Design a protein around this ligand. Structure first.
Ligand SMILES: [Zn+2]
Ligand SMILES: [Zn+2]
Lengths: 107, 149, 764, 400, 248, 127, 99, 50
DNA sequence: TTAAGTGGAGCTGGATGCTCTGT
DNA sequence: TCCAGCTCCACTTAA
RNA sequence: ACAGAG
């Protein structure tokens, strides 16, 4: 990440001193000792998952005493939750029911 | 993109069903129908297009691209993906085209005029190269094909 | 309930054609040249001074263009009509007369009417003898009342300056390179210099390129050379989002590798890159102040207003990589149209400067050599530089003006006289810029932006297809406005000076820039109040009605355009689902209580422009009016042009058929005019017994085609007869041909010249 | 929307109007303030306002890399000279700030010391941007450079060499700096207020909205070089100041060949002198069949050429006046071949008529507007003298 | 026939994707024998074509995926004792996309053509995490090259074939059968012929230069025949095979 | 963060906090006055030409509309660009020929923009 | 070619000559088919313009009704007399001794 | 060709050997089928099919 | 350490439909 | 406006 | 050098 000197406002570089790593200016004496953990997270875009779960994938989220689906009122349906973008997104819930003479997709 | 293929599906069904409705109520000795049946001039598309319904006007294989900001013309609302906003002519040539439908049909027409104007330079150079490469090849009396060398 | 209709709304179109459109665009440019721009050229060149022997000077006070005159053998001169020029093969021209103040030892000698040349006078302009005559007095001049004018007569041939289509100078293009990189450019044409400057991302880092630099140079060095030295203030201008900073990051890391931390170091760096036409520091500092981005003013070598502009460019390149919103050159808001008067203005400025420099050369030769007599330049005012510069450029059609690096060819064409429509058709043509370089299939297409400005159908079929185009029936091309009150109003509508703020505000969502012709005039919050109030000030006549204002919300700018050359079209103003034009107003128009300019003043009609109808929502018909409609279309048949206006029921035909009639209808035999028997031409075709069309458009009545028609009504049986009609062939009747159907006359010329030579001998 | 809250009085003070500056620091955030930092000097040029400041940076705090500070100070200053020296000590002691000028005029900017219930405005003499200077690196290079190695017309004003020498003429003014904590700042802050009464009606600012609009949007042309006598159809709905009123009827009546009486009150409005003006209107229009009709002299003086194509014809105004006379006696012009009696072209008569009437089958033309009342205005006597005057016009026709 | 080809549209190899040049520009591309062309397609036949679960495995062995596409974040960490760039793999998304990559494999995706990074400098502290300790480039650069890696490290290829931009599964509509063929939009025929689970004996390419380099002159000769005849048939032209035979 | 509005700015400095604060406001190029005896021509009028005293009244209306009534005319007041760099309001006084005093009076946080209400000016007498 | 406008121009013109009118053909407007059909039947012609036609060769009537009307026809400048050309032998260029 | 003002060229072979090569090889009756796919091109057209 | 064979990037020179019909 | 050869220059192997 | 025609 860009961080800039309070004195002259040139761009800082990270270098190493005799006791700590420092943010340092190239044009003035200013240095800033890294005393504690500092971080910067990118969170890039993941792949699409839409065509990855279709067609009898290896899902696993089903559990004992799980709810029945609302149309058929039978537990013959899978349900899962996934991030669609990066993991800062709140996870979305989705479910699909597959029964005899009955095909549907629901949200 | 999925929405464009559903819209193009609906709009094709309209032309085809309105087309197959006109040809059932035409009588024999209808002169366009005679020329279509014997194949001397025209086709059942042309009959259906001037009686029943002109099709979706398509430019480069797609609905009319936005030539203003997020709309085709200022007469439609922005982002609107309705049939008439993107080049569906609901009129036939008998009923007469409306001002916006006439403009989209003229857009689709000029791409055929412009292809013909390009097709001369696009192909005549190609044929000159082919002839200079192939012209020496003659079928010989010993049933072989040999170059000049 | 249905929305009611005003059925007399079509009348606004005849009232419009009395003043604007329909070769009037040609006339109102030439008038602007000879009545104001010829004075500005003289004003910018009002003094000439010999370098040798100073304190002797020639001064230009005023310039006049006069009335057409012929110069004859024994120096008799008499006024001349346009038709005498066609016959005798001479140029229809008026003398340029100038008044001068100059030194003959006495330091103020004056002349009040020195003739320095002759100006071709375009027909039906303010100096032509035809203007304001009655049809009974056209007959004395052998001229036709319906003849459009808008053309010259040079050496007896009728020559039209065609409308040239151009790109708008001083605008940030953002476009893809051949290699798929994204960059930006701005062709910075001013009256003193045209130049192009580019923004390139050739290695993930931003370089500026210009023809005066031997190599393209990192943009952070240019920021530092302009005196924004801190890296923070640079990044504040470019943008403060994390991905915009990440994209600009590798460009800071370049300048920090070099020793460039100071303005003087940066200017030294640029100095060692300048191609040579003080060394390092001033050939850089002057170059940034005068030639790079030259349309952006720097007043006293303060570069703040140029830094904000070059930051706007870099930000638009950055945000065009993440999504490929590259701009299209094909949108007509970007296109500009250059007419007769704006080309001749450049030609005359070249000729007048060559005239002053030739006369300066004369003064420099004789004053420190020849004689004690304080010579008068009046004896050296040879007229031939002005006259033969004008007449050769118009006749040959090549406009090689080395002052502005312009080498156009094919600017003029001979006016076609195959029919009445062939002449009036040519007066509305718009030649394009590419001029058939290669089969592009990109600008040849019909862009939707041409709606109501350019005709959909009237284009050639052939290699010129889509490159030659014609105006619609109801279009107007703006002139250049005074530009003064637009600034004084805008600075009161809450715009803030961009010098009072740092970079960071440009990256706020609630801050929009205001541009006027590509110069930044400030920033504003609440752009909607600005745009609405500016339109109100236009409607009430305080701002000139051709000034367009529009918003781009994707790139957060408000644009105000006041330059000449942009297509305007009139629309009716609609407020709260009711049109302003009531039945009361249209009855008052027919009776004469009001004219079309009173529809502009009362805010009933306003001129929209192709950048401004991007914002507006326009109803075709009253029954299409919804809640959010701003304008109503006056007459939708005026989407078509002049030649397409002959076709009956064109909306019942397949579109290529209309295009072919627009070609065929220019070639039909007919009647040139009322002067056609007193007219001697290279080749003229006439039909003996012409008839007017039994089915006709309203456009046929506006252009008066049914006064001199081209065709005959034929009793057609649509049947298959004799087999000699298989492929478009048509069987005629022998008895009809004998009685006079299709009887035509062909007229051809033959001319001979008998000259008197330099030796006293003659042809006989 | 009534002013339900905070009707705030606004007062103006001039005691600091030639003294008050806005300084702003484009690269320093609003939370980091120079209030603690000791200031060592302030320099100004009072015209061509260019302020410079020098601020001391301490060296015992951990953020100062003394090893690098010794190096940069040794680059700038020769190792032991100290007669002229940017930094007195062996380290970089000082940061210098250099101003850029934002705008030439500042007349429209005011500082506003808000207090509860009142606002106090004060004009600004200047707005300056202060930036950290990098002049010490340029000088560090200059002291590294020296160790290693009847004329024609001229335009001095447009050159950086001449312009800088002009700015060098103004002598430096030195200022003592009193920061925000010092009592002089709490003292002089009271001079932004103005002593005055709670309620005063201002002698100035008395202009009206329509005078104010004309002041901020001045008219383009103070007077035009030509004068419009109005033969050209200028805007009849615009009450042109330099045109007399009577001429606006003349141009209108040339447009509107016939019009009703009552429209004159509707177009002029009751503020006209609507009784005397008939001696003007009598010269340009006369009432025929309940309505006004344009007089002959407005359309064609006696040398006009033909206005149409076909065979040319000369003007003959009594060839018009006889037609409008027939409309005064008869119900209409009612017969087929009046063009033979008056001898002129049918292309004249049927074109002249076409501006006042519409055709019905065989019986000529129909008068386009209904028979309004003559006696709407009070005048009794004109009803008989009109017949006397139209008898004279008939008697003129009786010569030919 | 080139003058009859109106440069038609409505052509997408039946899949409503994977646009192709056809008409005169496709004939021009064939007879020029250029070494690269716009829109190359490799058609790969799958041997275990029974069901989609096998298709998505071998699709993931040819289609390029970047490191950034499988990582839920990348972070710079500055500590007093050292500084490094860290990448955490989203092993849930690995387990769904059926890719054969983990932390120990990502160490092998890096160290190749990435500013001479050392194998020692890359550590695999857990099955989900990797850390890249930056080193001085020592050539036209500053040790602060972390800002280079922070935009460059996601774009390294962990799995698949580098020349393949994308791949798509295609479906037959005949009543008798249902089997999935794999369409590859890319320009490495040899690699697609050699991945486990592609029937290499029956894959083909548009590009005559690829077929020549991989299969020899006689397979390239047949591809000129097949591709000209394919382009002619789509525009409804017909030519006797003996003419395109002689040209090839 | 969101954006404040001029009704809210003046309400915070009246009720919630009695502390005084320096606004910075931009006026139109001409105020509705005459330069008093200043030897002119209908030239521009600025705050430098007027004399001390009450100059006008500032009205806050319902629905957040704010007006500056500065004569017979009312000018509209809106929030300017939100600056977040440091701004210092300073006196400079050249009390002697060569020396003087510089004094920092306070920091400036908010900008107000005053503009004429062109719709109201024009709705009086259209054109 | 779908030039339905020619088919309407023939019909509108025919209804026009029979009653002394010029029927308008303006784009996006014009005189409608429903109006001109009623003009033809009032004058005793068939509403769609088709007429009972007799062969001039054989004198026997034609089976199909033939569409009859006035269509505007314009003569173009391209005439065969200005275009017929023949060379047997003739003048030659000076540089290359070819025609 | 389409008879809409189309023009065509004519050449008269000036040699007996050029007549025979024109007549036997280039005659219309010897060229009823195109070389390409072997399909007839000289055949009936509109009003001969109808 | 360096001699050398081969990758990758920029410069350069070539090409872009057939005719009549007029000024 | 699009595209093959030719030459310059970094980048590993190898002695 | 420009416009045409197919
Ligand atoms: Zn610093
Ligand atoms: Zn189910």
């Amino acid at each position: 990440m860009l961080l800039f000197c309070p004195g002259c406002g040139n761009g800082l570089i990270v270098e190493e001193g005799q006791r700590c790593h420092r943010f340092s200016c190239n044009t003035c004496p200013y240095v800033h000792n890294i005393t504690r953990k500092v971080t910067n997270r990118k969170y890039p875009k993941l792949k699409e998952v839409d065509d990855v779960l279709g067609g009898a994938a290896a899902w696993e989220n089903v559990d004992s005493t799980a709810e029945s689906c609302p149309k058929c009122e039978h537990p013959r349906a899978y349900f899962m939750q996934l991030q669609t973008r990066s993991a800062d997104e709140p996870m979305t819930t989705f479910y699909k029911c597959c029964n005899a003479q009955c095909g549907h997709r629901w949200r | 993109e999925t929405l464009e293929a559903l819209i193009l599906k609906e709009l094709s069904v309209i032309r085809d069903h309105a087309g197959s409705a006109c040809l059932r109520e035409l009588d024999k000795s209808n002169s366009p129908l005679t020329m279509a049946l014997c194949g001397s001039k025209g086709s059942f598309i042309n009959i259906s297009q001037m009686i029943a319904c002109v099709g979706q006007q398509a430019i480069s294989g797609s609905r009319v691209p936005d030539g203003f900001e997020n709309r085709s013309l200022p007469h439609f609302e922005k982002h609107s993906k309705l049939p008439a906003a993107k080049g569906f002519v609901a009129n036939s040539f008998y009923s007469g085209l409306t001002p916006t439908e006439f403009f989209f049909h003229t857009m689709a027409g000029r791409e055929g005029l412009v292809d013909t104007a390009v097709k001369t330079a696009e192909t005549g150079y190609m044929q000159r190269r082919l002839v200079k490469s192939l012209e020496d090849l003659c079928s010989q009396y010993d049933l072989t094909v040999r170059s000049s060398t | 309930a249905p929305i009611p209709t005003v059925e007399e709304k079509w009348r606004l179109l005849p009232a419009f054609l009395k003043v604007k459109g329909l070769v009037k665009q040609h006339i109102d440019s030439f008038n602007y040249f000879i009545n104001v721009e010829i004075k500005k050229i003289m004003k910018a060149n009002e003094k000439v001074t010999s370098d040798a022997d100073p304190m002797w000077y020639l001064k230009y006070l005023n310039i006049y263009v006069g009335l057409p005159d012929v110069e004859e053998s024994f120096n008799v001169t008499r006024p001349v009509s346009p038709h005498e020029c066609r016959l005798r093969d001479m140029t229809y021209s008026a003398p340029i007369t100038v008044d001068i103040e100059y030194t003959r030892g006495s330091q103020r000698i004056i002349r009040n009417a020195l003739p320095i040349g002759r100006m071709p006078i375009m027909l039906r302009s303010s100096n032509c003898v035809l203007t304001g005559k009655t049809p009974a007095e056209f007959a004395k001049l052998n001229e036709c009342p319906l003849d459009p004018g808008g053309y010259f007569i040079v050496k007896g041939v009728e020559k039209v300056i065609l409308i040239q289509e151009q790109l708008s100078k001083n605008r940030i293009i953002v476009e893809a390179d051949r290699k798929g990189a994204v960059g930006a450019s701005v062709t910075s044409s001013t009256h003193e210099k045209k130049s192009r400057t580019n923004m390139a991302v050739k290695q993930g880092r931003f370089y500026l390129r210009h023809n005066t630099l031997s190599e393209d140079i990192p943009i952070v060095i240019i920021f530092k050379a302009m005196g924004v030295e801190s890296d923070q203030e640079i990044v504040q201008m470019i943008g403060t989002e994390e991905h915009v900073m990440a994209a600009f990051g590798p460009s800071l890391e370049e300048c920090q590798k070099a020793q460039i931390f100071t303005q003087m170091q940066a200017l030294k760096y640029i100095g060692n890159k300048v191609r040579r036409q003080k060394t390092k520091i001033e050939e850089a500092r002057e170059l940034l102040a005068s030639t790079i981005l030259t349309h952006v003013p720097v007043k006293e070598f303060n570069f703040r207003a140029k830094c904000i502009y070059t930051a706007v460019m870099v930000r638009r390149v950055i945000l065009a990589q993440g999504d490929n919103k590259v701009d299209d050159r094909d949108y007509y808001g970007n296109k500009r149209l250059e007419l007769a008067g704006q080309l001749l203005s450049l030609l005359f400025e070249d000729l007048f400067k060559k005239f002053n420099s030739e006369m300066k050369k004369i003064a420099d030769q004789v004053i420190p050599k020849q004689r004690a007599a304080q010579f008068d330049v009046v004896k050296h005012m040879r007229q031939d530089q002005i006259t033969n510069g004008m007449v050769n450029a118009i006749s040959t059609g090549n406009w090689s003006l080395k002052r502005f690096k312009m080498d156009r060819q094919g600017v003029t064409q001979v006016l076609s006289r195959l029919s009445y429509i062939s002449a009036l058709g040519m007066m509305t043509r718009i030649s394009s810029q590419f001029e058939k370089t290669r089969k592009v299939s990109g600008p040849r297409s019909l862009q939707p932006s041409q709606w109501g400005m350019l005709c959909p159908s009237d284009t050639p079929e052939g290699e010129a297809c889509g490159l030659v185009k014609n105006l619609a029936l109801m279009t107007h091309i703006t002139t250049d406005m005074e530009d003064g009150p637009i600034v004084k109003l805008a600075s009161n509508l809450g715009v803030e000076d961009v010098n009072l703020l740092c970079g960071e505000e440009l990256s706020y969502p609630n801050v929009f820039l205001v541009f006027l012709n590509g110069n930044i005039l400030g920033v504003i919050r609440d752009h909607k109040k600005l745009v609405n109030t500016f339109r109100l000030m236009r409607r009430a006549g305080y701002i000139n009605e051709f000034v367009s204002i529009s918003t781009n919300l994707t790139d957060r700018c408000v644009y105000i355009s006041s330059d000449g050359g942009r297509l305007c079209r009139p629309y009716i103003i609609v407020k709260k689902q009711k049109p302003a034009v009531t039945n009361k107003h249209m009855e008052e128009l027919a009776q004469g209580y009001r004219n079309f300019e009173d529809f502009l003043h009362e805010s009933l009609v306003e001129y929209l422009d192709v950048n401004e109808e991007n914002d507006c929502n326009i109803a075709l018909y009253e029954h299409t009016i919804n809640k959010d409609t701003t304008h109503l279309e006056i007459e939708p048949f005026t989407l078509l042009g002049v030649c397409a206006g002959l076709i009956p029921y064109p909306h019942h035909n397949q579109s290529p058929r209309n295009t072919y009639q627009c070609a065929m209808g220019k070639q039909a035999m007919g009647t040139i005019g009322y002067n056609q028997r007193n007219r001697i031409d290279t080749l003229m075709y006439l039909l003996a017994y012409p008839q007017k069309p039994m089915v006709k458009t309203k456009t046929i009545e506006l252009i008066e085609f049914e006064k001199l028609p081209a065709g005959q009504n034929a009793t057609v049986a649509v049947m298959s007869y004799s087999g000699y009609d298989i492929e478009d062939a048509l069987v005629l009747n022998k008895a009809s041909l004998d009685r006079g159907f299709g009887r035509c006359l062909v007229y051809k010329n033959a001319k001979c010249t008998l000259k008197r030579y330099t030796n006293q001998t003659f042809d006989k | 929307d009534d002013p339900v809250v905070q009707e705030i009085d606004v007062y103006l003070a001039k005691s600091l109007a030639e003294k008050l500056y806005l300084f702003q620091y484009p690269v320093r955030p609003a939370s980091m303030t120079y209030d603690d930092i000791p200031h060592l000097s302030a320099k100004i040029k009072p015209k061509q306002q260019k302020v410079e400041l020098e601020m001391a940076i301490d060296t015992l705090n951990p953020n100062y890399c003394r090893s690098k500070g010794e190096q940069i100070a040794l680059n700038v200053d020769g190792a032991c000279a100290d007669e002229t020296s940017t930094y007195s000590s062996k380290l970089m002691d000082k940061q210098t700030f250099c101003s850029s000028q934002t705008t030439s005029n500042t007349s429209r900017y005011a500082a506003a010391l808000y207090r509860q219930g009142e606002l106090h405005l004060t004009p600004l003499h200047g707005i300056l941007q202060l930036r950290p200077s990098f002049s010490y690196l340029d000088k560090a290079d200059a002291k590294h450079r020296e160790r290693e190695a009847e004329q024609a017309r001229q335009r001095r004003v447009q050159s950086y060499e001449f312009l800088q020498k002009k700015h060098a003429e103004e002598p430096w003014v030195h200022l003592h700096y009193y920061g925000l904590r010092d009592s002089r700042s709490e003292h002089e802050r009271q001079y932004l207020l103005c002593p005055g009464s709670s309620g005063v009606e201002n002698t100035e600012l008395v202009k009206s909205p329509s005078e104010y609009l004309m002041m901020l949007m001045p008219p383009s042309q103070e007077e035009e070089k030509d004068k419009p006598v109005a033969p050209s159809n200028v805007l009849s709905m615009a009450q042109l100041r330099t045109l007399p009123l009577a001429d606006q009827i003349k141009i209108l009546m040339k447009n509107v060949k016939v019009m009703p009486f009552a429209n004159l009150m509707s177009l002029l409005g009751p503020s006209i002198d609507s009784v005397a003006v008939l001696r003007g209107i009598q010269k340009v229009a006369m009432l025929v069949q309940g309505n006004w009709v344009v007089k002959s002299d407005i359309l064609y003086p006696k040398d006009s050429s033909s206005p149409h194509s076909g065979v040319p014809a000369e003007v003959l105004c009594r060839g018009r006046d006889f037609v409008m006379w027939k409309f005064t006696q008869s119900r209409w012009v009612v017969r087929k071949e009046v063009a033979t009696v008056t001898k002129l072209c049918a292309e004249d008569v049927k074109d002249f008529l076409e501006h006042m009437a519409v055709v019905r089958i065989n019986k000529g033309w129909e008068f386009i507007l209904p028979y309004d009342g003559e006696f709407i205005k009070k005048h009794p006597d004109v009803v008989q003298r009109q017949h006397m005057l139209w008898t004279g016009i008939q008697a003129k026709l009786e010569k030919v | 026939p080139g003058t009859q080809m109106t440069l038609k549209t409505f052509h997408f190899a039946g899949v409503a994707s994977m646009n192709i040049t056809l008409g005169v520009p496709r004939i021009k591309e064939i007879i020029n024998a250029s070494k690269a062309i716009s829109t190359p397609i490799i058609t790969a036949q799958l041997d275990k074509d029974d069901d989609a679960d096998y298709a998505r495995l071998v699709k993931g062995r040819i289609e390029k995926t970047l490191l950034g596409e499988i990582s839920e974040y990348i972070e710079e960490v500055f500590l007093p004792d050292d500084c490094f760039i860290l990448v955490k793999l989203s092993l849930e998304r690995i387990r769904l996309l059926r890719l054969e990559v983990n932390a120990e494999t990502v160490r092998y995706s890096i160290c190749t053509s990435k500013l001479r990074v050392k194998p020692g400098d890359v550590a695999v502290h857990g099955e989900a995490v990797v850390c890249v300790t930056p080193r001085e480039n020592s050539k036209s650069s500053m040790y602060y090259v972390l800002q280079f890696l922070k935009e460059d490290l996601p774009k390294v290829v962990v799995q698949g074939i580098p020349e393949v931009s994308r791949a798509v599964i295609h479906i037959d509509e005949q009543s008798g059968k249902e089997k999935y063929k794999l369409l590859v939009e890319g320009d490495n025929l040899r690699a697609v012929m050699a991945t486990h689970g592609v029937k290499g004996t029956r894959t083909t390419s548009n590009n005559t230069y690829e077929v020549e380099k991989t299969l020899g002159i006689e397979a390239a000769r047949t591809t000129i025949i097949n591709e000209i005849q394919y382009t002619m048939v789509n525009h409804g032209m017909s030519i006797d095979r003996r003419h395109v035979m002689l040209l090839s | 963060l969101p954006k404040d509005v001029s009704v809210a700015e003046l309400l915070r400095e009246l009720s919630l906090t009695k502390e005084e604060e320096l606004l910075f406001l931009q006026l139109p190029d001409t105020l509705p006055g005459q330069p008093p005896t200043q030897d002119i021509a209908e030239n521009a009028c600025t705050l430098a030409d007027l004399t001390e005293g009450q100059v006008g009244k500032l009205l806050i209306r319902k629905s957040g509309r704010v007006q500056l009534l500065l004569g017979k005319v009312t000018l509209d007041v809106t929030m300017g660009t939100a600056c977040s760099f440091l701004q210092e309001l300073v006196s400079v006084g050249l009390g002697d020929s060569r020396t003087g005093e510089m004094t920092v009076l306070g920091h400036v946080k908010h900008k107000l923009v005053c503009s004429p209400d062109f719709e109201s000016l024009l709705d009086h007498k259209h054109r | 070619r779908m030039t339905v406008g020619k088919l309407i121009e023939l019909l509108a013109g025919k209804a026009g000559v029979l009653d002394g009118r010029f029927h308008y053909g303006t784009a996006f407007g014009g005189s409608k088919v429903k109006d001109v059909c009623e003009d033809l039947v009032r004058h005793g012609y068939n509403y769609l313009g088709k007429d009972y036609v007799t062969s001039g060769i054989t004198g026997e009537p034609l089976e199909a009704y033939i569409y009859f009307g006035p269509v505007y026809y314009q003569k173009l400048k391209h005439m065969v007399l200005d275009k017929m050309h023949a060379r047997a032998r003739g003048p030659r260029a000076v540089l290359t001794r070819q025609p | 060709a389409d008879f809409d003002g189309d023009e065509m060229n004519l050449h008269l072979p000036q040699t007996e050997e050029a007549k025979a090569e024109a007549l036997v090889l280039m005659g219309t009756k010897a060229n009823l089928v195109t070389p390409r796919n072997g399909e007839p091109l000289i055949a009936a057209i509109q009003d001969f099919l109808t």
